[PDB]
Amino acid sequence: VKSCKGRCFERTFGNCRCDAACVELGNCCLDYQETCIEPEHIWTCNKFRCGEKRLTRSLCACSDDCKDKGDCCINYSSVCQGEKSWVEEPCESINEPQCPAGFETPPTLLFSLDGFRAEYLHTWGGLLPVISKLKKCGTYTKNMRPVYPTKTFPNHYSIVTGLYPESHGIIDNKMYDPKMNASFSLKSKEKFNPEWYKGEPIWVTAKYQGLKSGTFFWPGSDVEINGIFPDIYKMYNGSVPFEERILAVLQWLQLPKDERPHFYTLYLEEPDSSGHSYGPVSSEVIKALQRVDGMVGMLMDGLKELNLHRCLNLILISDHGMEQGSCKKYIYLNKYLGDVKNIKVIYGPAARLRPSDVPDKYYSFNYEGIARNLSCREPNQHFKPYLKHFLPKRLHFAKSDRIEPLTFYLDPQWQLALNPSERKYCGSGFHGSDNVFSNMQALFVGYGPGFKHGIEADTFENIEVYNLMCDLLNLTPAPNNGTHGSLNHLLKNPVYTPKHPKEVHPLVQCPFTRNPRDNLGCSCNPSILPIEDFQTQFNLTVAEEKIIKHETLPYGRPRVLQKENTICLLSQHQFMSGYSQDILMPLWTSYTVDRNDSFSTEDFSNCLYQDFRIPLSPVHKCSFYKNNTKVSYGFLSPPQLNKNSSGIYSEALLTTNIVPMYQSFQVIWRYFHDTLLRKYAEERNGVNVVSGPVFDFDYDGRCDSLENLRQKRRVIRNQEILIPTHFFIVLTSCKDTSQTPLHCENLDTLAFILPHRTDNSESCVHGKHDSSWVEELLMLHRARITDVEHITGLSFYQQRKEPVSDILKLKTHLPTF
Numbered sequence: 016v017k018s019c020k021g022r023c024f025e026r027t028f029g030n031c032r033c034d035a036a037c038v039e040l041g042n043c044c045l046d047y048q049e050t051c052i053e054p055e056h057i058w059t060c061n062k063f064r065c066g067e068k069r070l071t072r073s074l075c076a077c078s079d080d081c082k083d084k085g086d087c088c089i090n091y092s093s094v095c096q097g098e099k100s101w102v103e104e105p106c107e108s109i110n111e112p113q114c115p116a117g118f119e120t121p122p123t124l125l126f127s128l129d130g131f132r133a134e135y136l137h138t139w140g141g142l143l144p145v146i147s148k149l150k151k152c153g154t155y156t157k158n159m160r161p162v163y164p165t166k167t168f169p170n171h172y173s174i175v176t177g178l179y180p181e182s183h184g185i186i187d188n189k190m191y192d193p194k195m196n197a198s199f200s201l202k203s204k205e206k207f208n209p210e211w212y213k214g215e216p217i218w219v220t221a222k223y224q225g226l227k228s229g230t231f232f233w234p235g236s237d238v239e240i241n242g243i244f245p246d247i248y249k250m251y252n253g254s255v256p257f258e259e260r261i262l263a264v265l266q267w268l269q270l271p272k273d274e275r276p277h278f279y280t281l282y283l284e285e286p287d288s289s290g291h292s293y294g295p296v297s298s299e300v301i302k303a304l305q306r307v308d309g310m311v312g313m314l315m316d317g318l319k320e321l322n323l324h325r326c327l328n329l330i331l332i333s334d335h336g337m338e339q340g341s342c343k344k345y346i347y348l349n350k351y352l353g354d355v356k357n358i359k360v361i362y363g364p365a366a367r368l369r370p371s372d373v374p375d376k377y378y379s380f381n382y383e384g385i386a387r388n389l390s391c392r393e394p395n396q397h398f399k400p401y402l403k404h405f406l407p408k409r410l411h412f413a414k415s416d417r418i419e420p421l422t423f424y425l426d427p428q429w430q431l432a433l434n435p436s437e438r439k440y441c442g443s444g445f446h447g448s449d450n451v452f453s454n455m456q457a458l459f460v461g462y463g464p465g466f467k468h469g470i471e472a473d474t475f476e477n478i479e480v481y482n483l484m485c486d487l488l489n490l491t492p493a494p495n496n497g498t499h500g501s502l503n504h505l506l507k508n509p510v511y512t513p514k515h516p517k518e519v520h521p522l523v524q525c526p527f528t529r530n531p532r533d534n535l536g537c538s539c540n541p542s543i544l545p546i547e548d549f550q551t552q553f554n555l556t557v558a559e560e561k562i563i564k565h566e567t568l569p570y571g572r573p574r575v576l577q578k579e580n581t582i583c584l585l586s587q588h589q590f591m592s593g594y595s596q597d598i599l600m601p602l603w604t605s606y607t608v609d610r611n612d613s614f615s616t617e618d619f620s621n622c623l624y625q626d627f628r629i630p631l632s633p634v635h636k637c638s639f640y641k642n643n644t645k646v647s648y649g650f651l652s653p654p655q656l657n658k659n660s661s662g663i664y665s666e667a668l669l670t671t672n673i674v675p676m677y678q679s680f681q682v683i684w685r686y687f688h689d690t691l692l693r694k695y696a697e698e699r700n701g702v703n704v705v706s707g708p709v710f711d712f713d714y715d716g717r718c719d720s721l722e723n724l725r726q727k728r729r730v731i732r733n734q735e736i737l738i739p740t741h742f743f744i745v746l747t748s749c750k751d752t753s754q755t756p757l758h759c760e761n762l763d764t765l766a767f768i769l770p771h772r773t774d775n776s777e778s779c780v781h782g783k784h785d786s787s788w789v790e791e792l793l794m795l796h797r798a799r800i801t802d803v804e805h806i807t808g809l810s811f812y813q814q815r816k817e818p819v820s821d822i823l824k825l826k827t828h829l830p831t832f
């Protein structure tokens with residue numbers, strides 16, 4: 016008589032009413048809305064609905080018969096039968112999967128929360144019980160590094176291909192292809208054009224090996240790729256309520272095994288939408304985070320009802336983070352260029368520049384002109400013009416023709432446009448910045464039989480996730496940019512045991528050859544003690560060599576994976592080296608700086624000693640470089656470093672330990688060896704160093720073939736010389752600074768791929784002290800050892816006792832400061 020329970024929309028005599036007219040008259044029963052109306056709009060049971068008379072318009076049922084009829088609201092058992100929800104149950108280990116027939120290989124679900132920055136879980140974990148439980152019971156990283164630019168289409172397509180955008184072709188949400196003379200957009204018909212999508216998404220991989228896929232939204236999933244769609248897919252439609260997406264995937268998981276997928280995707284636009292609209296630190300983002308937490312909880316409750324909660328492998332992930340934009344942190348190019356109408360500038364933190372007149376002027380246009388015009392225009396400038404091949408190699412953001420030849424590197428929180436007309440609200444949340452910025456870092460939680468329980472893994476890259484999902488599905492991965500085995504530490508039962516790559520040809524010998532002491536044209540400093548009997552000083556006892564090998568190659572020598580290539584080992588007292596007869600240069604030197612080693616300030620310019628182990632060449636002589644304006648030279652193993660004396664190490668002045676080097680780069684190289692190497696050596700109680708040249712004229716992040724290198728030699732004083740595109744350095748010490756680099760239980764690594772440029776315009780060296788800018792340039796151009804391996808054709812640490820997967824983990828690491 017006081018409640019609507021059982022009488023919704025029936026006439027009453029006794030006081031309060033349960034019909035639509037009651038509202039206007041204000042004589043509704045107290046529970047009229049909750050009992051009669053709410054159920055048309057909600058997917059939950061509550062204490063008002065338990066044992067309800069079944070309503071015809073209700074989205075799901077809480078009636079006594081709802082299980083007979085199999086349309087109970089997902090939370091029915093928890094609310095109406097007092098059972099525990101998934102989140103309420105304590106963690107329990109899933110050592111054996113409990114799966115129905117058809118799931119002998121368990122299913123994998125890839126669940127994306129767009130724009131869920133890693134920081135959101137660090138700070139608001141207390142407000143997000145479900146995701147917090149997946150973290151506690153599963154495999155978590157505090158930070159998953161996205162791909163550059165940190166945008167939705169590039170990152171989502173990278174996750175399912177294991178490819179850098181430069182290789183998969185989806186370089187941003189908006190692109191121009193000059194070869195197609197077409198523009199790509201998410202709201203355009205070109206989004207459905209297969210020509211844009213390269214590589215092999217995991218649903219295609221799965222199809223070729225006989226597993227079906229069900230995608231509820233994913234970039235590429237509504238496109239015919241290699242002639243294939245997922246077995247079940249949805250045309251993208253952001254209006255579909257989150258609950259309906261989750262319920263559809265739960266329907267797919269109940270299909271008979273002949274049509275039921277193994278690979279699933281789920282995608283929600285939150286908290287990206289609220290992040291843009293209200294900023295990453297806002298009431299609206301907190302509410303959106305709790306909403307997506309609830310949607311994850313709805314999936315886990317759904318899986319529990321189906322007895323799939325100890326079967327399905329869940330990967331909860333995001334594409335990128337989110338940053339607070341400011342109208343005071345927006346650069347307008349019209350300030351420097353004027354209101355020119357010949358250029359089109361892609362706005363935001365990943366800003367790119369292209370001529371208006373395309374495809375005609377796309378390659379012919381004067382990019383270098385605008386690049387120089389916009390360089391070092393103000394002190395502490397918050398943007399930097401880069402030709403795409405000069406961007407840090409760690410971004411792997413040049414190979415594709417869809418990447419505009421001129422790009423901008425923006426500082427954290429800063430964006431760039433042509434003018435204030437050609438951009439959205441400057442005060443909105445944004446993303447797209449450098450993939451190592453804290454606020455761009457993404458979510459990763461793995462939960463299920465395949466994943467370890469209660470593990471916090473070190474930072475890894477989203478490009479590694481394709482190989483991981485292939486392992487979870489027992490698939491052979493397509494070729495991709497992931498290091499297969501680098502994420503084996505996330506898995507209960509790794510299926511792939513990686514092996515060190517095998518060296519193709521074993522090292523050729525460089526024997527001493529009796530020859531005359533030729534004139535190199537050197538004016539050596541008198542302090543330097545020359546090599547008086549070469550054959551005597553380089554005839555080493557097997558005993559003496561064992562000592563040197565142990566001190567200079569504690570991890571084994573770099574191995575060469577290049578096919579048509581002829582390298583020879585050169586032994587010296589302080590360093591070893593791999594010398595290329597083919598390019599008249601070492602591919603690598605290896606030495607070790609000890610804590611109490613001496614660095615000389617003594618001059619050693621225009622001083623070289625002949626190495627009688629290789630034929631003398633004009634480019635190995637001081638005379639070739641004397642007042643040469645076009646190129647100078649540098650040493651891989653530093654002459655400044657003496658281990659037996661306090662003067663200069665003479666053996667480092669050999670012609671075999673020199674590389675072509677621009678005068679401008681010598682500033683960087685001299686600062687590293689004089690100052691930094693000293694500081695690093697003291698700080699880390701010793702540091703093994705491997706340095707060498709890099710030849711990437713193709714700007715594809717791979718060592719160029721010998722064939723291709725023959726056509727890239729320059730002619731200088733009537734000699735053919737090969738000038739490196741970059742120089743690599745790999746520093747190795749021990750995690751425990753009590754031990755020295757020769758006796759590490761665990762390696763601490765730091766690697767660089769330094770651009771080899773004719774000026775220092777990148778660093779804006781004018782009214783700044785030398786010290787500051789060199790360290791900054793090194794940090795910006797740091798790299799994974801794997802990045803070095805790809806671009807040099809070398810393979811390091813092959814003699815370490817650790818299993819290969821732990822070395823792959825080490826090689827894929829990028830430092831964060």
Ligand SMILES: *[C@@H]1O[C@H](CO)[C@@H](O[C@@H]2O[C@H](CO)[C@@H](O[C@@H]3O[C@H](CO)[C@@H](O)[C@H](O[C@@H]4O[C@H](CO)[C@@H](O)[C@H](O)[C@@H]4O)[C@@H]3O)[C@H](O)[C@H]2NC(C)=O)[C@H](O)[C@H]1NC(C)=O
Nearest residue numbers: 178179182183213214215411494495496497715716717805
């Ligand atoms: C990320 O991982 C990517 C996937 O492996 C990888 O990209 C591959 O790069 C290689 C070389 O850059 C491509 O392989 C071939 O290269 C040879 C050498 O020129 C070509 O002969 C061959 O082209 C072919 O021959 C015809 C010429 O067009 C053509 O009609 C044929 O169909 C065929 O294409 C290839 O170009 C390979 O295609 C790339 N794969 C993809 C999917 O991009 C990246 O190197 C790697 N990135 C890094 C930084 O390591």
Ligand SMILES: *[C@@H]1O[C@H](CO)[C@@H](O[C@@H]2O[C@H](CO)[C@@H](O[C@H]3O[C@H](CO)[C@@H](O)[C@H](O)[C@@H]3O)[C@H](O)[C@H]2NC(C)=O)[C@H](O)[C@H]1NC(C)=O
Nearest residue numbers: 056072232249250251252253254255256257258259260263
């Ligand atoms: C994109 O998804 C939207 C939300 O899921 C969807 O909107 C909805 O469209 C349905 C069409 O079935 C409307 O529902 C109507 O259907 C019944 C039975 O056919 C009709 O008797 C009624 O008119 C009923 O309203 C919804 O009104 C509408 N929902 C919302 C929130 O707008 C779009 O249709 C989807 N777009 C595409 C491209 O398919």
Ligand SMILES: *[C@@H]1O[C@H](CO)[C@@H](O[C@@H]2O[C@H](CO)[C@@H](O)[C@H](O)[C@H]2NC(C)=O)[C@H](O)[C@H]1NC(C)=O
Nearest residue numbers: 192193194195196197198371372373374375376
């Ligand atoms: C490349 O695409 C542009 C853009 O569509 C083409 O330019 C247009 O030409 C059509 C007729 O061919 C005109 O009606 C449009 O007004 C033009 N659009 C613009 C914005 O200029 C161009 O013809 C295409 N092809 C090539 C190879 O240049």
Ligand SMILES: Nc1ncnc2c1ncn2[C@@H]1O[C@H](COP(=O)(O)O)[C@@H](O)[C@H]1O
Nearest residue numbers: 166167188201233234235251253284287
């Ligand atoms: N598969 C898709 N196809 C088209 N647009 C999409 C797709 N997935 C997401 N979007 C849109 O991309 C937006 C996110 O892009 P962003 O603002 O760069 O993070 C979402 O709010 C959607 O509007």
Ligand SMILES: *[C@@H]1O[C@H](CO)[C@@H](O)[C@H](O)[C@H]1NC(C)=O
Nearest residue numbers: 351352353355385387388389
């Ligand atoms: C850069 O070029 C623009 C024309 O696009 C011109 O307005 C401006 O003076 C130039 N700035 C210089 C010379 O740095």
Ligand SMILES: *[C@@H]1O[C@H](CO)[C@@H](O)[C@H](O)[C@H]1NC(C)=O
Nearest residue numbers: 538620621640641642643644
């Ligand atoms: C040539 O080099 C010498 C040192 O080798 C240097 O002192 C001098 O400045 C240079 N000459 C010219 C022409 O710049």
Ligand SMILES: [Ca+2]
Nearest residue numbers: 711713717719
């Ligand atoms: Ca290359």
Ligand SMILES: [Zn+2]
Nearest residue numbers: 129130167334
């Ligand atoms: Zn996104």
Ligand SMILES: [Zn+2]
Nearest residue numbers: 130287291446
């Ligand atoms: Zn976004």
